[PDB]
Design an enzyme around this catalytic site. Sequence first.
Site, short mmCIF file in Angstrom:
data_model
loop_
_atom_site.label_atom_id
_atom_site.label_comp_id
_atom_site.label_asym_id
_atom_site.label_seq_id
_atom_site.Cartn_x
_atom_site.Cartn_y
_atom_site.Cartn_z
N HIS A 9 0.82 -1.20 0.00
CA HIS A 9 0.00 0.00 0.00
C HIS A 9 0.86 1.26 0.00
O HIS A 9 0.58 2.21 -0.73
CB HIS A 9 -0.95 0.00 1.21
CG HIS A 9 -1.99 1.08 1.16
ND1 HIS A 9 -1.72 2.38 0.80
CD2 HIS A 9 -3.33 1.04 1.40
CE1 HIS A 9 -2.83 3.10 0.83
NE2 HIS A 9 -3.82 2.31 1.20
N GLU A 45 8.46 5.68 -2.69
CA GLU A 45 9.12 5.09 -3.84
C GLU A 45 9.88 3.85 -3.40
O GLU A 45 10.23 3.71 -2.22
CB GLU A 45 10.08 6.10 -4.48
CG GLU A 45 9.36 7.23 -5.20
CD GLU A 45 10.22 7.92 -6.27
OE1 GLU A 45 9.67 8.29 -7.34
OE2 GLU A 45 11.43 8.13 -6.03
N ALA A 71 -6.44 -8.51 2.51
CA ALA A 71 -7.70 -8.76 1.83
C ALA A 71 -7.78 -7.94 0.55
O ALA A 71 -7.08 -6.93 0.40
CB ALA A 71 -8.89 -8.43 2.73
N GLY A 73 -9.34 -5.16 -1.83
CA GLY A 73 -10.01 -3.90 -1.61
C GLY A 73 -9.93 -3.11 -2.90
O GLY A 73 -9.44 -3.60 -3.91
#
Lengths: 120, 118
Positions: A9, A45, A71, A73
Site C-alpha cells: 500500500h 518510492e 484482503a 479492496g
Amino acid sequence: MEALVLVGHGSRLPYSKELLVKLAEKVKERNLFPIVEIGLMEFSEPTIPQAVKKAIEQGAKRIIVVPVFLAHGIHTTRDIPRLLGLIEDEIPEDVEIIYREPIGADDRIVDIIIDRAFGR
Amino acid sequence: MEALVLVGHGSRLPYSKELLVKLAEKVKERNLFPIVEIGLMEFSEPTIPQAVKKAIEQGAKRIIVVPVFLAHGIHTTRDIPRLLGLIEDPEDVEIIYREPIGADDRIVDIIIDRAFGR
C-alpha cells in the site's frame, strides 16, 4: 526470465515500505527468482510502475505481481490493476504480467495471530 | 477470563470484514480462548469499541487485542490506541495491545505460494 514484484500500500509512516523491503530480502534469500522488486502504491518510492519497469529492464519476460495485502479492496481490484494496464482507464509485447491473489485468511495467518496474541 | 479481539481496517468493500470473520472462525476452531470477537476500524460493524464491549460483557477480564495489519501505520499507532483508551485523545479489565503481523517468515511462505498461484 521471470521476476517477482511485491506491491504494497505505502504509507506516510515508514513501516509499510520497511515491511516490503524486509519481505523482498527474505524472498531473495530463498533464491527462487532471478529478479525481485518492490513497489508501493502511494506515498513512497519505488512506485509500482517503477518496480515493473525495473524488472523489465533487468530482462524479465514474465512479471509475477503479488499484492502484499491481507484482503482484496479497491486498491487490489481497481488501482493496482489500472497501474499494471490490466484494466482500461509501457508493457512490451514479449512481456506478460501475472497478477496474483492477496494473502487472505491463510491458516498461517492464524498461526501468526496466535503468536502475536501471546506476545511472540 | 481472557478474550481475543481481532481488529482490522474495514472497507467499503466486503472483503476486509469477510477476512476478519474467517480468521476469527479459524481461531475459534483451535479452542484457545473462551471469547473471540472481531472489530473493524471503519466503514463497517462490529466496530472496535463494540468488539471490546462484547468481550467484557461476556465476562472477559483480560482483553488481548491483535491488530490484523501487515505493518504499523497511523491506524495502529494512533487511531486504534485512542479507541482503546490507551493514549490520551474497565476497573477489573486489562487491555493487552499486541503487535501486527510484520515481516514474518510465514508471510514469505504465503507470498511464494501466491506467486505460484497457490
